[PDB]
Design a protein around this ligand. Structure first.
Ligand SMILES: Nc1nc2c(ncn2[C@@H]2O[C@H](COP(=O)(O)OP(=O)(O)OP(=O)(O)O)[C@@H](O)[C@H]2O)c(=O)[nH]1
Ligand SMILES: Nc1nc2c(ncn2[C@@H]2O[C@H](COP(=O)(O)OP(=O)(O)OP(=O)(O)O)[C@@H](O)[C@H]2O)c(=O)[nH]1
Ligand SMILES: Nc1nc2c(ncn2[C@@H]2O[C@H](COP(=O)(O)OP(=O)(O)O)[C@@H](O)[C@H]2O)c(=O)[nH]1
Ligand SMILES: Nc1nc2c(ncn2[C@@H]2O[C@H](COP(=O)(O)OP(=O)(O)O)[C@@H](O)[C@H]2O)c(=O)[nH]1
Ligand SMILES: [Mg+2]
Ligand SMILES: [Mg+2]
Lengths: 57, 430, 87, 221, 428, 428
C-alpha cells in the first residue's frame, strides 16, 4: 500500500526481498565515522527501510 | 438482426438437436419451458415473455419426436414445428425421396415459409442430417431440392455423420452415401462433416471414459455447432457471419467437404493441472490424434483453414500460433493457396452441458479445414459400391420404390469424376 | 471410500485413473500399513493444514530467488512465440 | 528460467522420488494439491514445478515403470492431485531382471510414449539445463530401459546435460543373482551417451545409519 | 471552417473510429455524454473541424457510420464513446458482405450507396468550407474493401478538387485473417491509385511488434492496437485545430509528399512510444525523439525502410519545444542517412511544430513517410494474387456475381505499373 | 563532460560492480529511488560522469549488465540499490556457459555479443565527450572471462583511442575455486595483454587475509569482501568527480604508470583500514597512512613486493592535507627503501590529492603498484597450465566445441613471453 500523487494503491507483492542478503551485507567498520546507520549495515535498519518504502510489482 | 434457421431431419439430426438446443438454452438464460427467469438470432419472442426456438423437427417415425413432445422440452418448441411421419424410410433413399417422403414436404416447407417471414434478416440454413439411413438421406435431399428454388442464393450449410472407414450400423451404407451426394453438390454450399469412430477414440484417448454412448457422443457435436454459430450470438474482436463460411472454405464449386476439430477436449481432472495457452490448443488442432474425421492429415495437403476462438483469448499470441505453423514441414499446404488461414475471435467462454464430461475451460478452438486427404474416404466408399454393385446387391428394394437402375451407374461415374477432380486440383503447378 | 469402487475392481481402477477416491490413508488406519504409505502419513491433507502451525519447530525463512520482471517477460515470450528473440 | 527434468525409472527410481517430492514441497510452501495459501515474492519452485492458470503446481517428473504395482501407490497416496496422471506411465509386466527384456522385447514400445511426455515437459520448459534419471544397476527396467532412454535422448535432445543416478551393486551381497551381468550390460551402452553418473552404494548407507545415525534395523526411509 | 468529413465502412472502420473519436473527444474536452468541458479556450476555437452543432450545450461528430451487417454498429452504439454519434448516420442493411469484392461493390453495397450519400451530402453542404474526406476501412474484408472504394469513386465525381485521406489496413505475409484476401486487396488498391489523394498503409503485425518490443504489452487487446492508428490520425491534422509556430494542414502534406500523382502511399509512425515500467528511466528530449521516429522497428507497415530509399518525409511535432534542435537534427538525420535518400531531391524532410500536446503526453510527434520500400508490399501481394489466379482458386464467388475475367487482369496490370513506377525512381 | 561507460560481466562483476554502485550512490547522496537528497551542492556538478539525467531529480547509472544466465542478474535487482539501473540495459541469455572459456567466447557469446554491443554503443553515442570504459569481471570462469575478453576485443576496434580498464580477479595460490582455472586464466590474459589499457589484480585469499588479520573480522561476508574492492576502485576515479589541489584523471594515471606496452598489470591497496577497537589507539595523519599504503599485508594481490622491484607506484591521496608532508613522505619512502626501486627511473612515485575522501572516513589514499614481483602469479598460472596440458587434462570440453590445441600453445607461449620480459627488466 503506497500513495501515489495522494491517492492510495493496493499491493499484492513488494519489491526485493524481505530479508537482507549476505552478498550485499557489508559491515559498518568500512564506514566507521558515519552518523545515521546505512540499511546495508544491519537487518533492523533494512527492516525499517522496507517499512518506509512500499512499491507493488 | 442476424439469423439462423436450423433443420433437424432424421434420427441422428433430432438426437443432435436435443443436445445443441440443450446448450443453446444455457448460453442464454432461458428455462426449458421457454421462459426467462443478443438472443434473437436463434430464439423468437412471444408477448407474454417466452422465447420459441427457430427450428423444425421432422422424422418419418414418431418414436424419436414423441420423447421430445413428452419430455422436458414440450413447452419450448412450437407444437407444429415437430413434424411427425408415420412410416419410416427403412434405410432407403427411395422411400425418403420418392414415395412417402414426397407426402410431408408440403408441410415442412410450409413451416419453413412461416418461419422465414418472422425474421428480419435471414442468411443461412443449418440442416442436421446423416448419410446413413433413409430420412436422413432421402428427405434431406428432397428438402435441398426445394430450398434451392423457393428461397434463392442463401447459405445452405449441412452437418452430416459420415461413415467411418470400417464402422457402420447398416448394410446399405454405400448405397445411401452414393445418392445423397447427388444433391449435396449442386444444391449445397459447405458440408461440415464428422464421423462416429473418431469421436469414440477421442472419448477414450483424450477423455478417460470407457463404454461411451450416444448422449456423450452428441454433446461434442453440440459444442462444435455452438462454436460455429457463436459469432452470430456474442460479439467479439473478429465476428464471423454465416455468409463467409461458404466463400472461404470452398475453392472450387464441387469441393466443399471440410473436417471439424474441437481442441480442448479434456476431463475436469486434467483441466486444472494443465494450463492451455492458445499456442498449444492450436497445435492440438492439427494433431493427427485429435481428428474428429478418421482421415490422418499427413497423406494430403491443406486447402483452407478456419479457426474459431472463444473466451479469454487475445489476437497477438494466436497470431504467433499460426505464425509457427506455416513454418512446420509436416503440416503441408497446397501451392496455389499461399493465404491459407482464417481466424475469428469471440469473447464468451464455453459452457458445460449439465451432468457433462467436458471440463470448465476458458479457451476453445474449432478447426474447419478443407483437406486433400479426404479423397481416400471417397476412394474406399466407391470401392465398397463396386464390390456391392457387381452382383446387384440390395437393388430390388430401391427400384421397387420409384428408382431406375441407371441412376446407380450415373451416381458411380459422378463420384468417380468427383475423385478425379479432387486429384487434379491437388497438384503442384510448374 | 465405498461409493467410488462399489466393491468392484473395475470401478476401483476407473476411479484410480480418473482420481475420484475421497479418503486418504490417514483417517482410516492409525499406522502406515503399506511401507510406501509412510512418505505421506504425517502430512494432514484436510484443506490447508500446514507443517508450521502444527509442530512449530521446522520453521525456516526462505532465501528464495525472485525472478525479475525482465525475466518474467522473457519467459512469457519464449513460452508463447518461438519466433520472438528479444536480446 | 533454470529448471531440470526428472525421470524416475523402476522401483529404485520411484521409491527415491517419493522422498524427493515430499522434500521439495516441504522446502517450499507447496501443498499436496499444489494450491499454496503481505510481503515479497517467491519464484524458487520454477526449478521443479510449473504454475498453471488455475493456481496449481505440477512437478516436472515422469514416473515410468514396466511394473504396475509400485508406481500405483502414488495414485492412491497423497500426491495424486500433485502429479498430472499422464506422467505416471505403467506397463503390465516387469522385466524380471532381464536386461534383454526391458531393452529389446517389452520396453521397445513404451519409448515412443515416454519421449512423448518428455517432449510435453520440454515444450513447457523455459530454459532446460539438465536431466535427472534415477536408475539402479540391478534389475531390468533400471538397466535395460534406462540405457535405451539415454540412447534415445542423446540423439533426440543433442547437447544437454544428462545427470543420472546409480545404486551400485554391493561387494559382498546382492539382492538378485544376475546383477553382475546387468551392471556390465547397463554400463556398456551408457558410457558413450551420458555426461555424469552419480554413484551410491546401499550398505555404505546402512553403516552410515548404523554408526552415525544410530538407529537399529533400518529400512527404505 | 477547414472541416473534415469522417467516413467508416466495415468492422475495421467502425472500431478504429470508435477509438479515434475517443482520442479527439479527449483532446477537445468532450464528455462522453456529449457536453463540452474543456478548461482552456484553445480547444473551443477550432472544434468545427471534426464536430457539429447540437442543442443544450452538446456537440455531435461529423461522422457517418455504415456497415452492411447490423452487428458491428450494435457494439459501436454500446461502446465507450458511442452515445455522441447521431442516430441518423447509422445507415445499414440486413446481410453481411461476406469477404467479397462483388458483394460490396456491385449488388449488395450498390443499393446502399444512395442512402449513405444522402447523409454525406447533408453533412458536406452543411459546412462552411470542406477540405477533405476521411475514410477508415480494411483492404482484406468485404464491406470496407468493396463498398469503401465505391464510396470513393462516387465522392471524387461530385467533389473533384477536395483532397482525400484513406487509412487502410494492409495484408500480412506471415499469417492471414481472410482466406480470399489477395482477391480483395488488389481490386481495392486498383480503385485507390487513381481516385484518392493521400493513402496510409497500416499493418497489424507491425503493430504487434510495436506492442511486444516497444510497448512491452503481454496481452494487447484491439483497443491498444487501434489507439496507435487513432493517435496517428489525430496527429496528422493537429495544425488545423491548434495554433502552431509552423502550420501544416493536409494539403501542405499533400504537396510536400506527393512529387508524382501516383506515388502517395505512406508509412505512418508515432514518436514517444515506451514501455510502462520503463517510463521514469526514459528522459524524453528531441534527440531521442527524432532517433525513435526513424528506426526500422517503429513503422506501422511491415516494409522495412532499410531495403529502400525515401522520397519525401514529414514530421509534425506537438507540444512546447524549441526549433533549433528540430531543424538541426533533421539536418543530422538527412546527412547521416544520405544513402537512404534520393539525390535528385535536395531537401527531403517536412517539419511542423504546434504548441498543444496530446492529452497525457508533453512532447509527441507523428512520422509520415513516402518511401520506395513499399514496392515489396505490392510485390508480395502480386505474387499472392498470381499464385491464386493462375489456378482460378477462389474465382467463382466473383464471376457468379457479375464480374469479368477482364478485371483481375486490369487490377494486376495496375499493380505492376505501380511497382515498376516505384522501382524506376530508385535509380537516380 | 568526461564520461565512463560501465560494464559488468559474469557473477563476479555483477556482484562487485553492484556493490560499487551501492558505495558511490551514497557519495553523491542519491536514494534507492534515485531522487537526489544531498546536503551540499558540491556533490552535484559532476554527476554526469557516472549517472544519467532523468526528470524530477531522478538519476540513472549507465551499466550494461551482461551474463549468459539471469539468476545473478535477478539477485542484484532484489538488493537495496537495485532499481536505479535501466531495465533495457539488462542483457541475458538462456543457458549458462559452465565455467568454460570456450562456451563464453564462441558458442553462446557469439549469439549475444551483438545486442550488448548495440546497447554499449547506444550509451557511448549519447556521450558529451567520451573518455573510456569500465569492466568488472574475473579470470576464472566462462561467463566473466569468455564474455569480458570478447567484449573488450569488440570495443577496441571501434574506439581505439580511448582507454578500457578491466577490474579483474586472479586465481589464488593455496586453494582454487574452479578446476579449470588455469585454462581460463591463460586464455583470458592472452586477450588482455593485447587489447586493454590497464587491469587490476585482485586475489580472493589476499582479501581473506586482510579481513582476518588487519580488519580483525571474525565472519567476513561477501559484502565485507567486495566493499574493499569498491573503495579501492572508487578512489582511482575521484579526480574527475570532485575538485582537488592536484587532480590526476584516468589518462593522467595511464601515462604515469605503464612504461612498455605489455607491462600494465597493476596491484591496488587502501590506506585507512583499522580494526574496531584500534580507532582511539591510532592517530590519523599522512605518515600513519603511508605506513599502511606500502604495507605488504595491505596489497590486494598475493605477491610480496620484497621478492621483486617496483617500476612506478601511484598514491591517490584524499583529503585534508598539505603536500609538503605528502611529497616529503614519498621522498622518505623512496630514500630508505632504495634497493627495491629500479635505478633506471629516477623518481618512482606518483601522487595526487582530492579534498573529498570516501563516505565515512576522514582521510584516505588508494595505493596503485606496478611491481615486478607480479611475475610469480603468472609463473604459477604457467606451470599449472603446463601440468594439466602436458598429458591432456580437461580439454575435450574445449577441443570438442570450437578450437584445437594450437590456440592453447600460442597462448601459453604468449604467457611465457611476459615472465621472461619481466625478468629481463628486473635486473636492469
Ligand atoms: N453422432 C450421432 N450419430 C447418430 C445418432 N443417432 C443415430 N446416428 C447415426 O445415424 C445412423 C443411423 O441411420 P440414420 O441416418 O439415423 O437413419 P434415418 O435416416 O434416421 O432413417 P430412420 O432410422 O428410418 O429414421 C447411424 O449409423 C449413426 O451413426 C446420434 O445420436 N449421434
Ligand atoms: N534401500 C532401498 N533399496 C531399494 C529400494 N528400491 C529399490 N532398491 C534397490 O534396487 C536394487 C535392485 O533393483 P531392482 O529391485 O531390480 O529394481 P529395478 O532395477 O528397477 O528392476 P525391477 O525390480 O524389475 O523394477 C536393490 O539392490 C535395492 O537396493 C528402496 O526402496 N530402498
Ligand atoms: N488493426 C485492426 N485490424 C482489424 C480490427 N478489426 C478487424 N481487423 C482486420 O480487418 C480484417 C477483417 O475484414 P473486415 O473489414 O472486418 O471484413 P468485412 O467487414 O466483411 O469487410 C481482418 O484482416 C482483421 O485483421 C481492429 O480493430 N484493428
Ligand atoms: N568478490 C567476489 N568474488 C567472487 C564472487 N563470486 C565468485 N567470486 C570469485 O570468482 C572466482 C571464480 O568465479 P566464477 O565462478 O568463475 O564466476 P563466473 O566467471 O562469472 O562464472 C572464484 O575464485 C571466486 O572466489 C563474489 O560474489 N564476490
Ligand atoms: Mg436414423
Ligand atoms: Mg520391479
Amino acid at each position: 500500500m503506497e500513495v501515489i500523487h495522494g491517492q492510495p494503491y493496493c499491493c499484492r507483492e513488494l519489491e526485493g526481498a524481505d530479508i537482507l542478503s549476505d552478498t550485499f551485507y557489508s559491515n559498518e567498520l568500512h564506514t566507521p565515522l558515519e552518523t545515521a546507520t546505512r540499511p546495508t549495515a544491519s537487518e533492523d535498519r533494512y527492516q525499517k527501510f522496507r517499512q518506509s518504502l512500499q512499491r507493488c510489482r | 438482426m442476424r439469423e439462423c434457421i436450423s433443420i433437424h431431419v432424421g434420427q441422428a439430426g433430432v438426437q443432435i438437436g436435443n443436445a445443441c438446443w440443450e446448450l443453446y438454452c444455457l448460453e442464454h438464460g432461458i428455462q426449458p419451458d421457454g421462459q426467462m427467469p443478443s438472443f434473437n438470432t436463434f430464439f423468437s419472442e412471444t408477448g407474454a415473455g417466452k422465447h420459441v426456438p427457430r427450428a423444425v423437427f421432422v422424422d418419418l417415425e414418431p418414436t424419436v419426436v414423441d420423447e421430445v413432445r413428452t419430455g422436458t422440452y414440450r413447452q419450448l418448441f412450437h407444437p407444429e414445428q415437430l413434424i411427425t411421419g408415420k412410416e419410416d424410410a427403412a434405410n432407403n433413399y427411395a422411400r425418403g425421396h420418392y414415395t412417402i417422403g414426397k407426402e410431408i414436404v408440403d408441410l415442412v416447407l410450409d413451416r419453413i415459409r412461416k418461419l422465414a417471414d418472422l425474421c428480419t434478416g435471414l442468411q443461412g440454413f443449418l440442416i442436421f442430417h446423416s448419410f446413413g439411413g433413409g430420412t436422413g438421406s432421402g428427405f434431406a435431399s428432397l428438402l435441398m431440392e426445394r430450398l434451392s428454388v423457393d428461397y434463392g442464393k442463401k447459405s445452405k450449410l449441412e452437418f452430416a455423420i459420415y461413415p467411418a472407414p470400417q464402422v457402420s450400423t447398416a448394410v446399405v451404407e454405400p448405397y445411401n452415401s452414393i445418392l445423397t451426394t447427388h444433391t449435396t453438390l449442386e444444391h449445397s454450399d459447405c458440408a461440415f462433416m464428422v464421423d462416429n469412430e473418431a469421436i469414440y477414440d477421442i472419448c477414450r484417448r483424450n477423455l478417460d471414459i470407457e463404454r461411451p454412448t450416444y448422449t456423450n457422443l452428441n454433446r461434442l457435436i453440440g459444442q462444435i455447432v455452438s462454436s460455429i454459430t457463436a459469432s452470430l450470438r456474442f460479439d467479439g474482436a473478429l465476428n464471423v457471419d454465416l455468409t463467409e463460411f461458404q466463400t472461404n472454405l470452398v475453392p472450387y464449386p464441387r469441393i466443399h467437404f471440410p473436417l471439424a476439430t474441437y481442441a480442448p477436449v479434456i476431463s475436469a481432472e486434467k483441466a486444472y493441472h494443465e494450463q492451455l495457452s492458445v499456442a498449444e490448443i492450436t497445435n492440438a488442432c492439427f494433431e493427427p490424434a485429435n481428428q474428429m474425421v478418421k482421415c490422418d492429415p499427413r497423406h494430403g495437403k491443406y486447402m483452407a483453414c478456419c479457426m474459431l476462438y472463444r473466451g479469454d483469448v487475445v489476437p497477438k499470441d494466436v497470431n504467433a500460433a499460426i505464425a509457427t505453423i506455416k513454418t512446420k514441414r509436416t503440416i503441408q499446404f497446397v501451392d496455389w493457396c499461399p493465404t491459407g488461414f482464417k481466424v475469428g475471435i469471440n469473447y464468451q467462454p464455453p459452457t458445460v452441458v449439465p451432468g457433462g464430461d467436458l471440463a470448465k475451460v476458458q479457451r476453445a478452438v474449432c478447426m474447419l479445414s478443407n483437406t486433400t486427404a479426404i479423397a481416400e474416404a471417397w476412394a474406399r466408399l466407391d470401392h465398397k459400391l463396386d464390390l456391392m454393385y457387381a452382383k446387384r446387391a440390395f437393388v430390388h428394394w430401391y427400384v421397387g420404390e420409384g428408382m431406375e437402375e441407371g441412376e446407380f451407374s450415373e451416381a458411380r461415374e459422378d463420384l468417380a469424376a468427383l475423385e478425379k477432380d479432387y486429384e487434379e486440383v491437388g497438384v503442384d503447378s510448374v | 471410500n465405498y461409493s467410488v469402487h462399489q466393491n468392484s475392481h473395475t470401478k476401483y481402477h476407473e476411479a484410480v485413473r480418473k482420481v475420484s477416491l475421497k479418503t486418504f490413508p490417514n483417517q482410516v488406519f492409525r499406522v502406515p500399513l503399506t511401507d510406501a504409505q509412510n512418505f505421506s502419513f504425517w502430512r494432514s491433507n484436510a484443506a490447508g493444514a500446514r507443517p508450521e502451525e502444527t509442530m512449530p519447530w521446522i520453521q525456516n525463512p526462505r532465501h528464495c530467488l525472485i525472478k525479475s520482471a525482465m525475466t518474467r517477460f522473457m519467459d512469457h515470450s519464449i513460452l508463447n512465440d518461438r519466433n520472438f528473440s528479444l536480446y | 528460467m533454470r529448471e531440470c527434468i526428472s525421470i524416475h525409472v523402476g522401483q529404485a527410481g520411484v521409491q527415491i522420488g517419493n522422498a524427493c517430492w515430499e522434500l521439495y514441497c516441504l522446502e517450499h510452501g507447496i501443498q499436496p494439491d499444489g494450491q499454496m495459501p503481505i510481503g515479497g515474492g517467491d519464484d524458487s519452485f520454477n526449478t521443479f514445478f510449473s504454475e498453471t492458470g488455475a493456481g496449481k503446481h505440477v512437478p516436472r517428473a515422469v514416473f515410468v515403470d514396466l511394473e504396475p504395482t509400485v508406481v500405483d501407490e502414488v495414485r492412491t497416496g497423497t500426491y495424486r492431485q500433485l502429479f498430472h496422471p499422464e506422467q505416471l506411465i505403467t506397463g503390465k509386466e516387469d522385466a524380471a531382471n532381464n536386461y534383454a527384456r526391458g531393452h529389446y522385447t517389452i520396453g521397445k514400445e513404451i519409448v515412443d510414449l515416454v519421449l512423448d511426455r518428455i517432449r510435453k515437459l520440454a515444450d513447457l520448459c523455459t530454459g532446460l539445463q539438465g536431466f535427472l534419471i534415477f536408475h539402479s544397476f540391478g534389475g531390468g527396467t533400471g538397466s535395460g530401459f534406462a540405457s535405451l532412454l539415454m540412447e534415445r535422448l542423446s540423439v533426440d535432445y543433442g547437447k544437454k546435460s544428462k545427470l543420472e543416478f546409480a545404486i551400485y551393486p554391493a561387494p559382498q551381497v546382492s539382492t538378485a543373482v544376475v546383477e553382475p551381468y546387468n551392471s556390465i550390460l547397463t554400463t556398456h551402452t551408457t558410457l558413450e551417451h551420458s555426461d555424469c553418473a552419480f554413484m551410491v552404494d546401499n550398505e555404505a548407507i546402512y553403516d552410515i545409519c548404523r554408526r552415525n545415525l544410530d538407529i537399529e534395523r533400518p529400512t527404505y526411509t | 471552417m477547414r472541416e473534415i468529413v469522417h467516413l467508416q465502412a466495415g468492422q475495421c472502420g467502425n472500431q478504429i473510429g470508435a477509438k479515434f473519436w475517443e482520442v479527439i473527444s479527449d483532446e477537445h474536452g468532450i464528455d462522453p455524454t456529449g457536453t463540452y468541458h474543456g478548461d482552456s479556450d484553445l480547444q473551443l476555437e477550432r472544434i468545427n473541424v471534426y464536430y457539429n452543432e447540437a442543442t443544450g450545450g452538446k456537440y455531435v461528430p461529423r461522422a457517418v457510420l455504415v456497415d452492411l451487417e447490423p452487428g458491428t454498429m450494435d457494439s459501436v452504439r454500446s461502446g465507450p464513446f458511442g452515445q455522441i454519434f447521431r442516430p441518423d448516420n447509422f445507415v445499414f442493411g440486413q446481410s453481411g458482405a461476406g469477404n467479397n469484392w462483388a458483394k460490396g461493390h456491385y449488388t449488395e453495397g450498390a443499393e446502399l450507396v444512395d442512402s449513405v450519400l444522402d447523409v454525406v451530402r447533408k453533412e458536406a453542404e452543411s459546412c462552411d468550407c470542406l477540405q477533405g474526406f476521411q475514410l477508415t476501412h480494411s483492404l482484406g474484408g468485404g464491406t470496407g474493401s468493396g463498398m469503401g472504394t465505391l464510396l470513393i469513386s462516387k465522392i471524387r465525381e461530385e467533389y473533384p478538387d477536395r483532397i482525400m485521406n484513406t487509412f487502410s489496413v494492409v495484408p500480412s505475409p506471415k499469417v492471414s485473417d481472410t482466406v480470399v484476401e489477395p482477391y480483395n486487396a488488389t481490386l481495392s488498391v486498383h480503385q485507390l491509385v487513381e481516385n484518392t489523394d493521400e493513402t496510409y498503409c497500416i499493418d497489424n503485425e507491425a503493430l504487434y511488434d510495436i506492442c511486444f518490443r516497444t510497448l512491452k504489452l503481454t496481452t494487447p487487446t484491439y483497443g491498444d492496437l487501434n489507439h496507435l492508428v487513432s493517435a496517428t490520425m489525430s496527429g496528422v491534422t493537429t495544425c488545423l485545430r491548434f495554433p502552431g509556430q509552423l502550420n501544416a494542414d493536409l494539403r501542405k502534406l499533400a504537396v510536400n509528399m506527393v512529387p508524382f500523382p501516383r506515388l502517395h502511399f505512406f508509412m505512418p509512425g508515432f514518436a514517444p512510444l515506451t514501455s510502462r515500467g520503463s517510463q521514469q528511466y526514459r528522459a524524453l528530449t528531441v534527440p531521442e525523439l527524432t532517433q525513435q521516429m526513424f528506426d526500422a522497428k517503429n513503422m506501422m507497415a511491415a516494409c522495412d525502410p532499410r531495403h529502400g530509399r525515401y522520397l519525401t518525409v514529414a514530421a509534425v511535432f506537438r507540444g512546447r519545444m524549441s526549433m533549433k534542435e528540430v531543424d538541426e537534427q533533421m539536418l543530422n538525420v538527412q546527412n547521416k542517412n544520405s544513402s537512404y535518400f534520393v539525390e535528385w531531391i535536395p531537401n527531403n524532410v517536412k517539419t511542423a511544430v504546434c504548441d498543444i500536446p496530446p492529452r497525457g503526453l508533453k512532447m509527441s510527434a507523428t512520422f509520415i513517410g513516402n518511401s520506395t520500400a513499399i514496392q515489396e508490399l505490392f510485390k508480395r501481394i502480386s505474387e499472392q494474387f498470381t499464385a491464386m489466379f493462375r489456378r482460378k482458386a477462389f474465382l467463382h464467388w466473383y464471376t457468379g456475381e457479375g464480374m469479368d475475367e477482364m478485371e483481375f487482369t486490369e487490377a494486376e496490370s495496375n499493380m505492376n505499373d505501380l511497382v515498376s513506377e516505384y522501382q524506376q525512381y530508385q535509380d537516380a
